[PDB]
Design an enzyme around this catalytic site. Structure first.
Site, PDB file in Angstrom:
ATOM      1  N   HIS A   1       0.819  -1.254   0.000  1.00  0.00           N
ATOM      2  CA  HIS A   1       0.000   0.000   0.000  1.00  0.00           C
ATOM      3  C   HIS A   1       0.843   1.291   0.000  1.00  0.00           C
ATOM      4  CE1 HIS A   1       0.034  -0.572   4.534  1.00  0.00           C
ATOM      5  NE2 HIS A   1       0.243   0.753   4.470  1.00  0.00           N
TER       6      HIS A   1
ATOM      7  N   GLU B   1       0.849  -8.472   0.711  1.00  0.00           N
ATOM      8  CA  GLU B   1       1.013  -7.065   1.198  1.00  0.00           C
ATOM      9  C   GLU B   1       2.499  -6.715   1.381  1.00  0.00           C
ATOM     10  OE1 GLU B   1      -1.305  -5.042   0.953  1.00  0.00           O
ATOM     11  OE2 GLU B   1      -0.358  -3.276   1.854  1.00  0.00           O
TER      12      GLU B   1
ATOM     13  N   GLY C   1       1.418   5.676  10.942  1.00  0.00           N
ATOM     14  CA  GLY C   1       2.844   6.065  10.917  1.00  0.00           C
ATOM     15  C   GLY C   1       3.773   4.878  11.208  1.00  0.00           C
TER      16      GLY C   1
ATOM     17  N   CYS D   1       3.360   1.717   9.768  1.00  0.00           N
ATOM     18  CA  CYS D   1       3.442   0.722   8.663  1.00  0.00           C
ATOM     19  C   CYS D   1       4.894   0.658   8.141  1.00  0.00           C
ATOM     20  CB  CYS D   1       2.410   0.995   7.570  1.00  0.00           C
ATOM     21  SG  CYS D   1       0.705   0.736   8.144  1.00  0.00           S
TER      22      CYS D   1
END
Length: 182
Positions: free
Chosen positions: A41, A72, A146, A148
């Protein structure tokens, strides 16, 4: 403060960079040579900022499992003049549960941050922002925006990167040794 934080600090001080895309600042884990990982992402393009330096992206691959489900993790190869310390031997070979983990983050917003998140469950399937995702680890810590790309470690193993949370629980994508065979 103890052996968990010592192992985590050793990884953060040599194997992380601050990555900035159009979607914000991320902790980015360097694994070996010029190869790093970042949550999918982050939407990595042709150019990325690494410790505020304009960097060409030589290759980027959004991983899926053999059921064709999102993992992911994006593996990025950076046009950088310097190699990372090779930490592939700290990666687990199989899916597993773990005791006593630390989530470590380093950005502009959250420098030198270390969270003792405790026991880590092999959760498996998660609907993550509406995307079916496999190989998810779960910890009972209320993680926030903040964090990730944060690195999840035990003493002796680098086990995942933080990819989201629900306000009570945090979620990480597994790192496995087989993702980084060269």
């Amino acid at each position: 403060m103890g052996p968990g934080f010592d192992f985590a600090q050793a990884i953060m001080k040599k194997n992380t960079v601050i990555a900035r895309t159009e979607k914000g600042e991320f902790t980015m884990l360097g694994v070996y040579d010029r190869v790093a990982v970042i949550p999918t992402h982050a939407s990595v393009g042709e150019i990325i900022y690494i410790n505020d330096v304009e960097t060409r992206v030589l290759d980027a691959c959004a991983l899926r499992d053999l059921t064709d489900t999102n993992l992911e993790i994006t593996i990025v190869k950076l046009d950088r003049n310097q190699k990372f310390r090779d930490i592939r031997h700290f990666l687990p070979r199989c899916e597993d549960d773990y005791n006593d983990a630390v989530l470590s983050v380093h950005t502009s917003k959250f420098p030198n941050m270390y969270i003792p998140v405790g026991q880590v469950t092999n959760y498996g399937f998660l609907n993550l922002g509406g995307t079916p995702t496999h190989r998810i680890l779960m910890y009972n810590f209320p993680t926030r925006a903040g964090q990730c790309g944060g690195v999840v470690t035990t003493t002796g193993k680098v086990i995942g990167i933080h990819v989201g949370g629900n306000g009570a629980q945090g979620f990480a994508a597994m790192l496995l040794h087989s993702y980084f065979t060269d």
